[PDB]
Design a protein around this ligand. Sequence first.
Ligand code: CLA
Ligand code: CLA
Ligand code: CLA
Ligand code: CLA
Ligand SMILES: CCCCCCCCCCCCCCCC(=O)OC[C@H](COP(=O)(O)OC[C@@H](O)CO)OC(=O)CCCCCCCCCCCCCCC
Ligand SMILES: CC1=C(/C=C/C(C)=C/C=C/C(C)=C/C=C/C=C(C)/C=C/C=C(C)/C=C/C2=C(C)CCCC2(C)C)C(C)(C)CCC1
Ligand SMILES: CC1=C(/C=C/C(C)=C/C=C/C(C)=C/C=C/C=C(C)/C=C/C=C(C)/C=C/C2=C(C)CCCC2(C)C)C(C)(C)CCC1
Ligand SMILES: CC1=C(/C=C/C(C)=C/C=C/C(C)=C/C=C/C=C(C)/C=C/C=C(C)/C=C/C2=C(C)CCCC2(C)C)C(C)(C)CCC1
Ligand code: OEX
Ligand SMILES: [Cl-]
Ligand SMILES: [Fe+3]
Lengths: 34, 337, 449, 61, 344, 28, 129, 25
Amino acid sequence: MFTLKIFVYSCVAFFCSLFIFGFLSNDPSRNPNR
Amino acid sequence: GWFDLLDDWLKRDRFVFIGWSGILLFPCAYLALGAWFTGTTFVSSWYTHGLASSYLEGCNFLTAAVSSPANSMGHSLLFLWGPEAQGDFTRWCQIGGLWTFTALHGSFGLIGFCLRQFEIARLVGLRPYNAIAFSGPIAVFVSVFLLYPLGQASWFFAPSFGVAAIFRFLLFLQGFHNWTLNPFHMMGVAGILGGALLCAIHGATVENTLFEDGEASDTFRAFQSEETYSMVTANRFWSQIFGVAFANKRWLHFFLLFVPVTGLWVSSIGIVGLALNLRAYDFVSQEIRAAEDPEFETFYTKNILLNEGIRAWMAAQDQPHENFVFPEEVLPRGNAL
Amino acid sequence: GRSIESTGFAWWSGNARLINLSGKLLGAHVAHAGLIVFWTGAMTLFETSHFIPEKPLYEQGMILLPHLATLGWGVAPGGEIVNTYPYFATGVIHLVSSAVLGFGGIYHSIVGPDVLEDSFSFFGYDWRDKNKMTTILGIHLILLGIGAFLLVIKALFIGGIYDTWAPGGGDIRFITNPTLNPAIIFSYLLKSPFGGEGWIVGVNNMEDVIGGHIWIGVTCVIGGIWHILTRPFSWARRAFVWSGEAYLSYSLGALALMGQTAAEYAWYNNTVYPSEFYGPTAAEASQAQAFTFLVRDQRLGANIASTQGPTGLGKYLMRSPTGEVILGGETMRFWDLRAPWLEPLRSSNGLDLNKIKNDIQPWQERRAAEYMTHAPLGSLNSVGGVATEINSVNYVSPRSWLTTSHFFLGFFIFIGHLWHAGRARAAAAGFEKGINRENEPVLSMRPLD
Amino acid sequence: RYWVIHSITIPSLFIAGWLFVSTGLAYDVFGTPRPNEYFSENRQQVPLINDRFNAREELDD
Amino acid sequence: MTVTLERRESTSLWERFCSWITSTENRLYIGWFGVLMIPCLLTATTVFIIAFIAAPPVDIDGIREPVSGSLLYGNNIITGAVVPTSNAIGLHLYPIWEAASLDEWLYNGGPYQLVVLHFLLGVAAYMGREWELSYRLGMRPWICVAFSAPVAAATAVFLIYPIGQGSFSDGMPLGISGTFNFMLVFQAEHNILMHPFHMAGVAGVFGGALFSAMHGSLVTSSLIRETTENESPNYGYKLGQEEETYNIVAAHGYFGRLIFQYASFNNSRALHFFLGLWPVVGIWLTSIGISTMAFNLNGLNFNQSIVDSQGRVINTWADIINRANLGIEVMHERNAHNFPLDLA
Amino acid sequence: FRWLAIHGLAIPTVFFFGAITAMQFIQR
Amino acid sequence: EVAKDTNGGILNIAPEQLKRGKRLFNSHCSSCHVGGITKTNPNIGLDLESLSLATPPRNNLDALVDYMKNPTTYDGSESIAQIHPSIASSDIFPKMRDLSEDDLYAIAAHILTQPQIQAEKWGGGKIYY
Amino acid sequence: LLAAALALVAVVFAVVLALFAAWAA
Ligand code: CLA
Ligand code: CLA
Ligand code: CLA
Ligand code: CLA
Ligand SMILES: CCCCCCCCCCCCCCCC(=O)OC[C@H](COP(=O)(O)OC[C@@H](O)CO)OC(=O)CCCCCCCCCCCCCCC
Ligand SMILES: CC1=C(/C=C/C(C)=C/C=C/C(C)=C/C=C/C=C(C)/C=C/C=C(C)/C=C/C2=C(C)CCCC2(C)C)C(C)(C)CCC1
Ligand SMILES: CC1=C(/C=C/C(C)=C/C=C/C(C)=C/C=C/C=C(C)/C=C/C=C(C)/C=C/C2=C(C)CCCC2(C)C)C(C)(C)CCC1
Ligand SMILES: CC1=C(/C=C/C(C)=C/C=C/C(C)=C/C=C/C=C(C)/C=C/C=C(C)/C=C/C2=C(C)CCCC2(C)C)C(C)(C)CCC1
Ligand code: OEX
Ligand SMILES: [Cl-]
Ligand SMILES: [Fe+3]
C-alpha cells in the first residue's frame, strides 16, 4: 500500500512538473502570428 | 374573382401576415392565450381539485393555473352550451370548461400555426422544413394534453396549464408511471440535451472561427456570399479536440434540426404508452430476485420505494374525488422520518 | 473617445473604452470603491436600525453585525449584544467616507484629465511597463500587510476579539500569546482540504488566527518592499502576458479562488465565524439533534452506549472509521465537528461515555436544542426548515446567505477569468477580432489525414 | 400628440379593472370563492362536483 | 518591448519536447492541459469500466447495507451504476493506499471518489485544452466558456453538493437509475422545481432545442439548388468553399413574415452569438442552483400560503407538489434516519 | 389589422393589470 | 370561544387577539411548535388531546399561561424551566423578556383556537401538511 | 508521512526544474 502511494506520488509530481514548467516555457510565443 | 380577391387581400404584405391560415390561427390562438390569462387571474379550482388557483385568491405566477375539469365530467368536451353547464358561464368555469376551451382552441391554434408555416413557405418559395420541425411540438401537445387523458379516466389527470401544476403532473407521472425509467423518455432527454448542446456548440464555434472583416473589437458590425467564419479552421479544431468534426454545413444544420425534433416524437410514443398505463415501470428479474433475496438492492428498487411514497401521500391530496382515506399507520415510510 | 467609431467598442462593452485612459479609469475605480463603502455604511445602519435587543443575530438576517461582534464590539459573555452603538459608529464613518470617495470618483471620471501620463509621471502608467506595475503592486501589498497588522493590533492590545472557545463560554479576550511557530501555521497551509483536515478552514483557535495574520502581515510587507525595489526576472517576463486585461484576468482568478475559500469558511468554520452570531453550521446542527435526542432518551432510562439501532449500528453512539466514539445516525458524517458546547464532553478516544452519562449540563442541552432548531436549512423566500416544511418560521441562516452568495460570485468571477484571459491571449497575439483571410493558419498546415 | 386619448383611456381601463375587483364583481362573474366563502356553516369539507349532468343543482347546494 | 515576448530557444531537448507537446500536426492535440487530461481521464475511465462491470456491492449510506451496482452482480445497463462512497467516510480523502485492502476499498466506495476526482480534473483540463488549441490555431478563445457551462454542472453534482452536505455519498451516482434517485431525493429536500435557477435551466435546454430546430429548419429551408433530384442535397456543398450554401435573405424574410419584421435577425454573427449564449447561460444558472442548494438555500416555499377568513389553509398546486416531496422524503433511505429532522 | 392586433393585446393587458393591483390590497 | 379556566370559564376571542397571538407564537414558539408538534420532543405536542391529558391539564388559557410562566414535566412532578423557555427563566431565555400577560394569553388563545379551525392539522405533523 | 515520499517528489521536481533551468539559460 505504501509502494502504491509512492508510485502515484511519483506520477502526479511528474505530470504536474511537466505542466507547470511546460507552461512557463514562453507559451504566449506559441502562436501562428509569431 | 371573389376567391381571388379574398386571396389577394389575405396575402398582402402587412406588419403581421394573415392568410387563410390566419383565418384559423388568430382567433384560436387569441382565445387560448386569453383563456389562460382569464383563468389564472380570476377563476378558482375549488370545486374541481379543492385548490386555490388564481391571483384573485392569492396565487402567484408560480402557483396559479387553469386546472383540469372535475373527474366526474369524464372526457366531456364541456361546451358552454353543453348538458353540464347548460349555458351558465359561472357554472361552466366552476366545472372546468376553461380547460377544455384552452386545450381545444390551443390545438386548432397549433394546426393554424403549422398551416401558417406551410403557407408562408410556399408563398416565399422555400422548403417547408420549419413546419416539419414544428410537427415535433405538436406531437408533444397532442400526446400529453389530449391522448394521455383520453386514455385515462378523465381530463382531470391531464396537465393543468400552470407552473406548479405542471410540476405536479411531472411528479405524478414519476410516482405512478416511473416515467424516468421509460426508454422513450430517455430518448426525449437525449433529444433535448443534445439539441441544447448543438445550439451552444454551433454558436460558440461560429463565433470563435470568425474572419477579421473589420478593425473594431466589435466583430458584430463587420457583417454577402463569403462565409463569415472559417469552416476549415473549425473542422481542424474539433477534429483535434473531439476526434470528429463536421465538414458539410448542410448536414450540420439538418442534424441540429433532426436531434431535438426526434427527441420530442419519441417521448410522445412513450406518453401514449402511459395513456394506457402500458408502463416501463419494472424490471421483473430484479423484483423476483429482491423478493427472494432481502440483501439484494439496486438504485432501481430504491426508486421503486420512492414511487410508493409519492403515490400514498399525494394520492390522498391529489385525488379528492376518490375519498381516499389512509390512516397514518398504513402510510409507507422509513424509521424516524 | 466615447463612441463606437472612435473606440471600436459598443455601448455595452462601453467600459472597455477606459483601458488606456488612466484618469477616467482611476475615476471608475475610486467611484466604485465609493459604492462599496457606501453599501457598507448604509447596510450597517440598516442592520443597526432593524436590530432587536433580546434576539440572536442570526434570527434577524444580519451579516455585517456578526463581523463587528466577532471583532469584539458591544458583546457580553455568551454572545449577548448589549451595546449596539459602535456598530452605528462604523456605519456612519463608512457612509461619510463614501461621500468623499464618491466625490473623487466623479471628479476623476468626468472633470479631470483622461490621461495621467501627460500632466503627471508618478500616477501615469503604460500597461507594458513592468517596473511601474510591480511598484504599484508592492505598494498595495504593503497596504494589505498594514491591514493585517491592524487586525493583529486590535486583537492583541485594543480590547481583543470575541473568543467562543474562552474558558467560561464565549467572551471577548486579548490574545496574549499568539502562535508564531512556522510548523503550526504553515501546517495549516500544506494540509489536505478533505474531511478531518480542512486546509486553512480548519483553524480553531484565535492564537493561530492572529499569529497567522502576523505571518501574513510580515509576508505582505516584505513582498511589497520586494516588488517595489525589484524588476521581474526573465522567466516571468517570458511566461506572462503583460497587459491590462491580462492583469484583470489574474485578479479575477484570484478572487474566484478567494470567493470559494470564503464560502467554505462561512460554511464549516465556527471560530472566525462564531455560532453565537452567525448561527450553527450544518454539521453542528445535525450533531446537535443527535445530542438532543441522546439526552432525551437517556433521561427516559435508556443505556445509550448499548442502544442498538435498526441497522445494527449505535442509535446514539458508534465509532468513526478511525476508532473515535461519535454520535450515531447520519451525523456520523459530521464527526469532525468541534463546538465549544460539546468539547467539555470530549476525551482522548472521542466522546467520553462517563461524562455523557453524568456530566451533561443544562446549558449544553439548551445549546443543542437551539442549534438543531436553527439549522442552516430554508427556502429562497426565507421559510425556515426543510423543503417540505410549512409556512411559519421566517428564517434563513446567515451562513447560507454568505456561502451561497459568495459561491455565485466566485463562480461568475471565474467565468470572467476565462473570458478575459482568453481575450488577453488573443489580443496579445493579434487575432482577437477574427481570422486573417489572407493569413489563415490552418491553410498553411498539413492536413490531419 | 397621440398621448391625449391614451391619457383618457389607459387610466380609465386601469381603474375599470381595479373596480372589477374592488366591487367584487369578479367573484360573482367567475364564481370564485371569497376568503370567507370556502367553508359555510353547514359544510366543513371540500365541495367537489360529483354529478356530471347535474352539476348545476349540485353547485346550487 | 510590448506585450508578447516574441523569441525562441534554439532546438534544445526540452524545447523539442515543448514543441511536440504543443504540436498542431498531431492527429489529437496534446497540449499541457492534455499533459494533465490524458492520464486523469485514462485512470478514471479504466476504473469506471472495470467497476461498472465487476465491482462488489457498496455500503453507500454507511449503515452496513451494501448496494449492488455492477453488471456481474445482477444489474443491467439501466440499473447498473458506480455506487457513491460510504457516508461513514463523508468528505475524507479515501485513496486505495489508505485502506487495509482493495476489498475494503471496494466495500466503502473508493472507486467513486477516485473516478469523480480524476474526471473533474481531466474535464477541467479538457476545457483548458479547448482554449489551448484555439490559441495555437489563431482562433477566438471563447469555446471553453461555452464548455465551462457543462463542466460547472458536473462539478456541481460531483463535488460541490457533497461538500455542502458533508459527504460524497450525496454525490450523483455514476449511473442512470442512480441519477434518477439523485434527482428525486434532491426534489424532496430542496424543492428544485420551485427554484428559479432550475427554471432558468429548463429555459436554457428547452430554448436551446427550440433554437437548434429553428435555425436548422430555416437554413435547411433556404438551401440553394446545387443538386439533382433524388440526390442528397448535402452533396451540393463542398468543404472549404467560400460561396454561401443557402439564401440568408430568404430565411430572414420567412422568419420576418412568420412573426413580424423586426423579430428577425439580419446579422448572422448576432444570431450565432445568441445561439451560443442562451443555453450556456441557462446551464450556468442551473449549475449555480445545484451548488447553492448544496448549501440549503432551497426553492420557493409556498406551502399553506393561502388562508381563508376563518384561518383554515386553502391548498394550491404547491401543496400537492409538497405532498409528493413528502412521499419521497419519508420513503428515501428508510433505515438511515434515527431522528425526526433530516439536517444532513 | 395593426390596430386590431395591438389593441387586441394591449387593452385587456391594462384591464388585467389594474385588477391584479387591486388584488394586492385584498385582506383576509 | 375557548376555555379560560378549569371552572368552565368561557370567553370569546376577536381576530385582533388571534392576530397578535399567531404573530407572537411564530416569533417565540413556532419552531418546535412550528406547527405545535415539538421538534425537540415529539412525544409531548401542542395537540388538544395531549394538552388535555397533561397534569395539570393545559386545556385552558390559565393553565397555558401558567406553563409559560413556570413549565413542568408532563406529570407535573418536576420543573423544566432550565430547559424550557419561560418568564421564570427569561434570564437564560432572553426571547421571553419582552412578553407580557396579554402576550401570554394571546399565545395561549392561538394555541387553543388552532385545533378548532384546523382540526387534525394542529399537532398532527407532516401527515396533514 | 515517510521521508521516501518527500525524497521522490523533490527528486522528480528538481530534475524537471533543472531541465527548465537549462532551457531558460
Ligand atoms: C473585476 C471585475 C471586472 C472588470 C473590471 C471587468 C471589466 C470589463 N469587462 Mg468583464 N466580466 C467580469 C468581471 C469584470 N469585467 C465577470 C465576472 C464576467 C463574467 C460574467 C465578465 C464578463 C465579460 C464579458 C462577456 C465581456 C466583458 C467585457 C469587459 C470590458 C467592458 C465591460 C463593460 O462595458 O461592461 C458593460 C456592462 C454591462 C453591459 C452591464 C451588464 C449587467 C449584467 C449583464 C447583469 C448582471 C446582474 C447584476 C448582478 C444585477 C442584476 C440587475 C438587477 C438588480 C435588475 C471591461 C474591460 C467585454 C470585453 O471583453 O470587452 C473588452 C465583454 O464582452 N466582461
Ligand atoms: C454578499 C452579498 C449579500 C448577502 C449574502 C446578503 C444577505 C442578506 N441580505 Mg442583503 N443586500 C446586499 C447583498 C447581500 N445581502 C446588497 C448588495 C444590498 C443592496 C441592495 C442588500 C440589501 C438588503 C436589504 C435592504 C435587506 C437585505 C436582507 C438580507 C438578508 C435576507 C436576504 C434575502 O431575502 O435575499 C433575497 C435574495 C434574492 C432576491 C436573490 C437575488 C437574485 C440573484 C442576484 C440572481 C439574479 C442575477 C442574475 C441571475 C444574473 C445573470 C447572470 C449573467 C451574468 C448571465 C440576508 C442576510 C434583508 C434582511 O433581513 O436584512 C435585515 C433586507 O431587508 N439585504
Ligand atoms: C505610494 C503611493 C500610493 C499609495 C499610498 C496608494 C494608496 C491607495 N490606493 Mg493607490 N495607486 C497608486 C499609488 C498609491 N496608492 C498608483 C501609482 C496608481 C496607479 C495610477 C494607483 C491606483 C489605484 C487604484 C486604481 C485604486 C487605488 C486604491 C488605493 C487605496 C486602497 C484602499 C484599500 O482598500 O486598501 C486596503 C486597505 C487597508 C488594508 C486598510 C489600511 C490601509 C492603510 C493603512 C490606510 C488606508 C486609509 C485610507 C484608505 C487612505 C489613506 C492611505 C495613505 C495614508 C497611505 C489606498 C488609499 C484603491 C481605492 O479605493 O482608492 C481609494 C483603488 O481602487 N490606487
Ligand atoms: C500580492 C500578491 C502578489 C502578486 C500578484 C505577485 C506577483 C509576482 N511575483 Mg511575487 N511575492 C509576493 C506577492 C505577490 N507577487 C509575496 C507576498 C512574496 C514573498 C514575501 C513574493 C515573492 C516573490 C519572489 C521571490 C518572486 C516573485 C515574483 C513574482 C512575479 C512572477 C509571478 C509568478 O511566476 O508566480 C508563479 C508562482 C509560483 C508557481 C509559485 C507557486 C507557489 C507555491 C507552490 C506555494 C503555494 C502552495 C499552497 C500551499 C497552495 C495554494 C492553493 C492554490 C494552489 C489553490 C509576479 C509579478 C518573481 C519575479 O518575477 O521577481 C520579481 C520572483 O522571483 N514574488
Ligand atoms: C483525448 C481526446 C478524447 C476525445 C473524446 C472522444 C470523442 C469520441 C467521439 C466519437 C464520435 C463518433 C461519431 C460517429 C459518427 C461519425 O463518424 O460522424 C462523422 C461526422 C462527419 O460529418 P461530415 O460533415 O463529414 O458529413 C458529411 C456527410 O457525410 C453527411 O451525410 O461527424 C458529425 O456528423 C458530427 C457529429 C459527431 C458527434 C457525435 C457524438 C456521439 C457521441 C457518442 C454517443 C455514444 C457514446 C456511447 C458510449 C458507451
Ligand atoms: C376566456 C373566454 C373568452 C376570452 C377572453 C379573453 C380573450 C381574455 C383576454 C385576456 C387577456 C389578453 C389578458 C392579458 C393579460 C396580460 C397580462 C396579465 C400581462 C402581464 C405582464 C407581466 C406580468 C409582465 C411581465 C414582464 C415582462 C413582459 C418581461 C419583463 C419583466 C416583466 C415582469 C415586466 C371569450 C370572452 C372570448 C369567450 C368566453 C371564454
Ligand atoms: C462614473 C459614472 C457613473 C457612476 C457614478 C458613481 C458610481 C457615483 C457614486 C457616487 C457616490 C458613491 C456618492 C456617495 C455619496 C455619499 C453621501 C452623499 C453620503 C451622505 C451621508 C449622509 C447624508 C449621512 C447622514 C447621516 C448621518 C451624518 C449619520 C446619522 C444618519 C444620517 C442619515 C442623518 C455612472 C455609471 C452612473 C455613469 C456616469 C459616470
Ligand atoms: C492568516 C491565517 C492563516 C495563515 C494564512 C497564510 C500564511 C496563508 C498563505 C497563503 C499562501 C502563501 C498562498 C499562496 C498561494 C499561491 C498560489 C495560489 C499560486 C498560484 C500560482 C499560479 C496562479 C501560477 C500559474 C502558472 C502556472 C502554474 C503555469 C505557468 C504560468 C503561470 C505562472 C500562470 C492561518 C492559516 C495560520 C490561520 C487562518 C488565518
Ligand atoms: O445520505 Mn443521501 O439524502 Ca442528504 O438528506 Mn440526510 O443525507 Mn441521506 O437523508 Mn436525505
Ligand atoms: Cl439521523
Ligand atoms: Fe449556423
